[PDB]
Antibody
Framework: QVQLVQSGSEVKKPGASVKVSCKASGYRFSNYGISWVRQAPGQGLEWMGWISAYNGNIKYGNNLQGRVTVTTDTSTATAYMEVRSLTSDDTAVYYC??????????????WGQGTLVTVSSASTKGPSVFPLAPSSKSTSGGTAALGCLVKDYFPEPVTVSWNSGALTSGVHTFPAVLQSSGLYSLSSVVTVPSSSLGTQTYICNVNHKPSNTKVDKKVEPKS | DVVMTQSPLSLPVTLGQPASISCRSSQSLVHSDTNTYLNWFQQRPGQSPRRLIYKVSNRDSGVPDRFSGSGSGTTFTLKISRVEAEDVGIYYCMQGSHWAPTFGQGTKVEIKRTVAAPSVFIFPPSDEQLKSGTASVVCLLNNFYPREAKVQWKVDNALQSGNSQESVTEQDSKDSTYSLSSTLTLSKADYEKHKVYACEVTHQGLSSPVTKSFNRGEC
């Protein structure tokens, strides 16, 4: 039950600032440090910094301009990381990890789930959800495929669930493709029993955190 | 700071066959306390890294025996005695001994599996999108291996060019198969110009190419 929970996705304008949070459970927070690591999308892990609730000691890897600031609140067992004067090169996923309390070896044994920070001068765009209805053309005997198409959204990410998380088996949410417009698009599909097309309800829960967009689209068969 | 050099960038392995990932370091990882300190992390897609090995060879809780660590000085290796489908993902080596903890580039581990033919489905454009002035036709190749598959769009039997995009899922963590969505995107005018829309799939698992088609009037 050692657990680190980070905040949701963030989109910021160039020059603005972001403050990711990292709430710890399952261990004495004051006896451990926190290391912050940056993973640019599709790139390797880069260590950013370390802060110890035990000592008060802070280390930064590369921060001559003072744009990054790692902090902690021991009372609420929460670490924070703040990045200021953001640039498009700061677009990345940020992780917090439990780490050594003093100057020993960093182990980083437990990580948080991550936080995607996107930096763009463009307005955030909500997705258009369209049904990929199941039909005879989308059936191969005892299985039928259905889905929805999430189209024309910026920036990433969109999280697609089915039936509020109750349908996860057989779900393929595809990675997003870059369109000519600069907007993203993906499709989420699922294979179900065709005999159950008459009695089951399949709903797309499309959530776009940057645009505050939450769309539920019911996918119903077509003859 | 220490430079972790990881090899190889990509490692395709067959189920039940071993895998070997090397991590070299610019400076010796033997610390003043006389213990060598190297960690190995596993990152499944969309998830955060999970620590598999600490202190060169020590397995963390819940880490299968199949994962093994070894090494000395600047040269270390992670081995998988028999690779299983649940081993898809990127593997990183990390040193925390020196002032700036540093990681390796990462090794993507892909699974080699028995040939499985795709299940082909086709979804015509919805009516809302047509109202919006665009038509997206979706062709879905489901649960196949190998990754290599040719999808060709034909509109009124004329082969299409330059107006479709493909997306491939991550290799499934259970059956080690892929899925692929080819999306042909047109304007509603181009969509109404023709009636027969088909996607033709060629794959190693199919003896002959499979075509799925629909007529614009019905479905």
């Amino acid at each position: 039950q050692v657990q680190l929970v980070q905040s949701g996705s963030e989109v910021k304008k160039p020059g603005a600032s972001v403050k990711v949070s990292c709430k710890a459970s399952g261990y004495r927070f004051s006896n451990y440090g926190i290391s912050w690591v940056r993973q640019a999308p599709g790139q390797g892990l880069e260590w950013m910094g370390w802060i110890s609730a035990y000592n008060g000691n802070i280390k930064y890897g590369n921060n001559l301009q003072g744009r990054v600031t790692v902090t902690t609140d021991t009372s609420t067992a929460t670490a924070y990381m703040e990045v200021r004067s953001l640039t498009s090169d700061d677009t990345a996923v940020y992780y917090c990890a439990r780490d050594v309390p003093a100057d020993g070896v960093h182990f980083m044994d437990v990580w948080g789930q991550g936080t995607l920070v996107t930096v763009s001068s463009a307005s955030t765009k909500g997705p258009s959800v369209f049904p990929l209805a199941p039909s005879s053309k989308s059936t191969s005997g005892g299985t039928a495929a259905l889905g929805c198409l999430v189209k024309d959204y910026f920036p990433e990410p969109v999280t697609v669930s089915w039936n509020s998380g109750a349908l996860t088996s057989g779900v393929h949410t595809f990675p997003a493709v870059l369109q000519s417009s600069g907007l993203y698009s993906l499709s989420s599909v699922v294979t179900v029993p065709s005999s159950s097309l008459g009695t089951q309800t399949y709903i797309c829960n499309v959530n776009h955190k940057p645009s505050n967009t939450k769309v539920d689209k019911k996918v119903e068969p077509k003859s | 700071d220490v430079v972790m050099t990881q090899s190889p960038l990509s490692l395709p392995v067959t189920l039940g066959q071993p895998a070997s990932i090397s991590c070299r370091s610019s400076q010796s990882l033997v610390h003043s306390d006389t213990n060598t300190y190297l960690n190995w992390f596993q990152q499944r897609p969309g998830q955060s890294p999970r620590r598999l090995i600490y202190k060169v060879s020590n397995r963390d809780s819940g880490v299968p025996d199949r994962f093994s660590g070894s090494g000395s000085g600047t040269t270390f290796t992670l081995k998988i005695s028999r690779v299983e489908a649940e081993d898809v993902g990127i593997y990183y080596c990390m040193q925390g001994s020196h002032w700036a903890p540093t990681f390796g580039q990462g090794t993507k581990v892909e699974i080699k599996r028995t040939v499985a033919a795709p299940s082909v489905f086709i979804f015509p454009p919805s009516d809302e999108q047509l109202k919006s002035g665009t038509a997206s036709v979706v062709c879905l190749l489901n649960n196949f291996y190998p990754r290599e598959a040719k999808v060709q769009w034909k509109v009124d039997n004329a082969l299409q060019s330059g107006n479709s995009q493909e997306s491939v899922t991550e290799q499934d963590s259970k059956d080690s198969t892929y899925s692929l969505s080819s999306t042909l995107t047109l304007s509603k005018a181009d969509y109404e110009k023709h009636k027969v829309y088909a996607c033709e799939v060629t794959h190693q698992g199919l003896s002959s190419p499979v075509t799925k088609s629909f007529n614009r009037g019905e479905c």
